[PDB]
């Protein structure tokens, strides 16, 4: 399968530059154009330009020409976008897409680019038990509070991944430039407290993993 492994969220101060890539496996990297698209705050979509991996033929949207630089690595099947002169407006989700002469094909997963002059500050994971809400005797709701972490990416998980049903992980809101997440797993009375419910939080930009539980 056309597995485009576009990857890595990362933050960069303004003025700086960044180089993101897409791995094309499953096919002939030289046969299809690789395109670059900008998904601005999970909302707006804009086209940056393309690159064709057999001759290096390329083109850009005049609006991204002064900051975008597209290149390819033919021997390792990878395309790269170089974003430079990074002001706040550059922080966004960038997709890499495959296109035949006529149409787009498979888009890559996505790259998050936080343009920030700020530091990386790990999440404070405080576990939540009831004692005051919808009783624990039939089906109970537990929570995990991930607060005060920067930058934006953290994934909340449960029971080593051994509790995927009934979980509501809400998005994050930013307090004074920190992000606060909260998720909740509605489990049976039998499970908590009888059994262990472990909250697994991960935050790349700080190398922070903390597996928690409660009373």
């Amino acid at each position: 399968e056309v597995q485009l492994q576009q990857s890595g969220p990362e933050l960069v101060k303004p003025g700086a530059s960044v180089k993101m890539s897409c791995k094309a496996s499953g096919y002939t990297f030289t046969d299809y154009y690789i395109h670059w698209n900008k998904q601005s705050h999970g909302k707006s979509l804009e086209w940056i330009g393309y690159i064709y991996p057999n001759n290096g033929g390329n083109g850009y949207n005049h609006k991204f020409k002064g900051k975008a630089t597209l290149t390819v690595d033919k021997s390792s099947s990878t395309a790269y976008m170089d974003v430079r002169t990074l002001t706040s407006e550059d922080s966004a989700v960038y997709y890499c897409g495959r296109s035949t002469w006529d149409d787009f094909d498979y888009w890559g997963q996505g790259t998050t680019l936080t343009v920030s002059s700020a530091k990386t500050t790990p999440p404070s994971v405080y576990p939540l038990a009831p004692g005051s809400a919808a009783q624990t005797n039939s089906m109970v709701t537990l929570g995990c509070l991930v607060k005060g972490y920067f930058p934006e990416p953290v994934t909340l998980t449960w029971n080593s991944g051994s509790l995927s049903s009934g979980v509501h992980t809400f998005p994050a809101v930013l307090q004074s430039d920190l992000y606060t997440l909260s998720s909740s797993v509605t489990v049976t009375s039998s499970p908590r407290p009888s059994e262990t419910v472990t909250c697994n939080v991960a935050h790349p930009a700080s190398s922070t993993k903390v597996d928690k539980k409660i009373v």
Binding site: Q39, G42, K43, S44, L45, E46, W47, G59, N61, H62, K63, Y95, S99, D102, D103, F104, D105, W107, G108, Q109, G110, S124, Y126, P127, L128, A129, P130, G131, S132, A133, A134, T141, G143, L145, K147, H168, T169, F170, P171, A172, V173, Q175, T180, S182, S184, T186, I214
Partner: protein, 216 residues
């Protein structure tokens, strides 16, 4: 640059119903090769846009037959027969005829259904947060519908607002509801100085609150 306008911005529909998302071009996007490059993308939340329809009329490999696009050079329409739950997401039309290639604004397909009163949960400050010095009172209003549903935090009866951050989870695709999180954050300092915490839930399902509370 060719402008792409996607009406409606938001389209609510129930299950088994039909949906029609329009997209129009500031000018013809019929290519000289004699082809119209208008694409239809469906981006599910927490995902990337995937291709549904290419060249107005054609459907991508493995896309269900319920989606059908059509249009005339300047006006296009994506059509859905019997909206299903997994059809939530933002719908996009794209033009790869004139450069630079533009994307239409997008369209929201939330799914209408039967009202559901939220299962409300309240959580006092966990132990570590106190030892550390702050206090966060959390409240999970899960599995509800419709979306407009207010939450007022009241301390010892008195309404409270500043220090509260609410977050909405996207409309679940398996059941068609929402979940919200309200977190009354207040310094342990101002917290120990009180007894009861009320997370009240106003909403449009049954016109009567669901109140959760705790006292320290």
């Amino acid at each position: 640059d060719v402008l792409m306008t996607q009406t409606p911005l938001s389209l609510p529909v129930s299950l088994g119903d039909q949906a029609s998302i329009s997209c129009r071009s500031s000018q013809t996007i019929v290519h000289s090769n004699g082809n119209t490059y208008l694409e239809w993308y469906l981006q599910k939340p927490g995902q990337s846009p995937k291709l549904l329809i290419y060249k107005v009329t054609n459907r991508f490999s493995g896309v269900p037959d319920r989606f059908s696009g059509s249009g005339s050079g300047t006006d296009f329409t994506l059509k859905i027969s019997r909206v299903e739950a997994e059809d939530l997401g933002v719908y996009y039309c794209f033009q790869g005829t004139h450069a630079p290639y533009t994307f239409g604004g997008g369209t929201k397909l939330e799914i209408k259904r039967a009202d559901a009163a939220p299962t409300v949960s309240i959580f006092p400050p966990s132990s570590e947060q106190l030892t550390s010095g702050g206090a966060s009172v959390v409240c999970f209003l899960n599995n509800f519908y419709p979306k407009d549903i207010n939450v007022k935090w009241k301390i010892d009866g008195s309404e409270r607002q500043n220090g509260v951050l609410n977050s909405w989870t996207d409309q679940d695709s398996k059941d068609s509801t929402y979940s919200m999180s309200s977190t009354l954050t207040l310094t342990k300092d101002e917290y120990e100085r009180h007894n009861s915490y009320t997370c009240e839930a106003t909403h449009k399902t049954s016109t009567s609150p669901i109140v959760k509370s705790f006292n320290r």
